[PDB]
Symmetry: D5
Subunit: 90 residues, 10 copies
């Protein structure tokens, strides 16, 4: 999954980017999923574990994001333009 | 649809958070798939289109991420810890 | 994917075409998806970001489809008959 | 099915636009698929059948697209920035 | 998923042309069912006519395909003989 | 079964026609698939089981299709105009 | 589909078993699907067809399950223990 | 999930038949997968674990299938004819 | 299913660990599905086979995990911190 | 979404168990996927991230499974049984 072109036609660099990105996407999905489960959960202990797991995947996502940012000038530009501001995003 | 719990059991703010995450996920996927296609592409004009679109999707991602950041203090703490650093992320 | 035949049995031409159509299908799907999220969205700022991404995806779609017609005369004709007209599409 | 938000939370014209877009995606897929089968086909008679369906689906697409165009001015603005031109698209 | 459940390299050109024909038929048929459901659910009249128009030609697309199947499948042919254009109960 | 619009927004007539088409599309898939397994099969006894069930599915398909055309004047018309003929089916 | 390890890592035997088990799974799903479509069907003629196709496919299941037994001693044991008995299954 | 019609339109005993069939299909899949895995496996201890589970799922399948036959006389007629037999299952 | 990198690119070891993990996942999925079926079932006999199959799959699961614990000192560490405890699993 | 039966037919306790199990399956998938990416990765910095994330997902998993143990006596049994032992697991 994620490979839309045969791997052997892709450079190792493109494949590492693929790895980081699909990993980031999966981390984000896990944030989303844990978060819905927290909201729907009844059992307090389970709810805490889910909110906990959820918040670690945020660290995972950030780490992958930063690795992407060091390898990708066009992305680094965009993260500079929007991240850590207070102005309207729109 | 990415909705793993029935929608009627999730609040407006959870649902918006979901709209944002999945939108971000789809944008990153676009970047990845566009990158793969750019690498594999033969027609030079097509190639220029795919790379143009890939770099725009980067903009969409940045925007969605920042909105997530502004109402997610836990995500915020982490991005401030790693974004724009020079040190070994994990190593 | 989107490849129903082994990639190695198709020409660079059929594959560049494939690249083009699949990208356009994904840009269209995103228009549609952002449209739905815009309608159902609550937070004004998110709705604005969702609308801004969606419309930008419209530019992508349009650029990809120009590439298609410029090397597809069977399609460039269809667009010629229907696009930018007043006539009942029927 | 391609509905990512509950059907009851979407207006009728959002749902018509969805029906138009998904239909257009399907036809486009058809063109792409038929193109692959054409390229990879052996039997000459099956081959002719496939290519016919294909160029026919091109019509269906053109149809849906103009219908989308009537209804979406942002989209109209864009097709009129790019269609039937001669200048490098991004390039 | 290509509808190939066995490696292509282990199937003859014939089996592969047949598969091309069947999977193409399945696809036209689906678009019929889909367009059908979309016609019924549709609200906008002009969209509706287009959806109906696409659907009927996909019926032509379908019929060409199953004829091609017939001419190169004695077992299928026989069965279409037995039941098509008929009026006795189907049991 | 494979429904792109909510069941409650679809008449019983459109829903039976859907039950008919999807069943047909399954039967046809089981044909294409048994045919692949037949070509790939090593064991003789299994070969025969596979081919047996394959030819029978063609009846099931037959059959369901007759049912369709009886309530689809447009599919009826496309059938008569391509089936059992010996002309080249595409230009 | 159904192959979770590369086909070139599997013996012809394992692959014929796989053929048999996936085909059995498919016949069974048909029966289930046909049974739902009967439970839900409105037109009578279609119903008879659906039930007809359904019951034929149970044969296809039995034929495959037999094939499996003759070459799976461990499966041959378990079927001897439970099938055609009047004793309770579990507790 | 294997429900092709809305659950609200199926009777309870159809839903129970569905539960049986789908669980049987899952147990049969686990047999197939564990078989493929045993064939490909490298570590001896893991191998034995995979082959263990595989055999027990064969039991799980036999139980379920006894349950289906005892309330589907049509599955019975066909089971009685083919199970434990010498005759070539097909020809 | 399971393989996101070409198999030719992964070691026998990584691929055995993949075989163990995906097996464990399938067996846990079997438990969840049987559990849901047990809850929704309206026939006592079927219910009993459902519930039976479901409790044996717990054992399959358990064997598979033990095999993982042995080969993965990282997984062993985490299992020892939390398994058979009484304190809150979390609140962070 | 992992629900095989409508959620309105499942108790809160079956749904929490579902929430636990599926979360546990996802964290295990993560381990597996990270393992494969580690093996295939080229860039050493990314690699350290992947293995970091991977080993943290192991804790997530341990946690969930400790939760399941605490309310599944048949599970808090196989685990007392097999876990932290040196016996041959199967045969």
């Amino acid at each position: 999954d994620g490979y839309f072109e045969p791997t052997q036609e892709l450079s190792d660099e493109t494949r590492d980017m693929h790895r980081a990105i699909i990993s980031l996407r999966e981390e984000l999905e896990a944030v989303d999923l844990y978060n819905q489960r927290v909201n729907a959960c009844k059992d307090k202990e389970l709810k805490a574990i889910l909110a906990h797991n959820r918040d670690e995947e945020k660290e995972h996502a950030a780490m992958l994001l930063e690795w992407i940012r060091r390898c990708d000038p066009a992305f680094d530009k965009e993260l500079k333009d929007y991240l850590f501001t207070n102005k309207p995003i729109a």
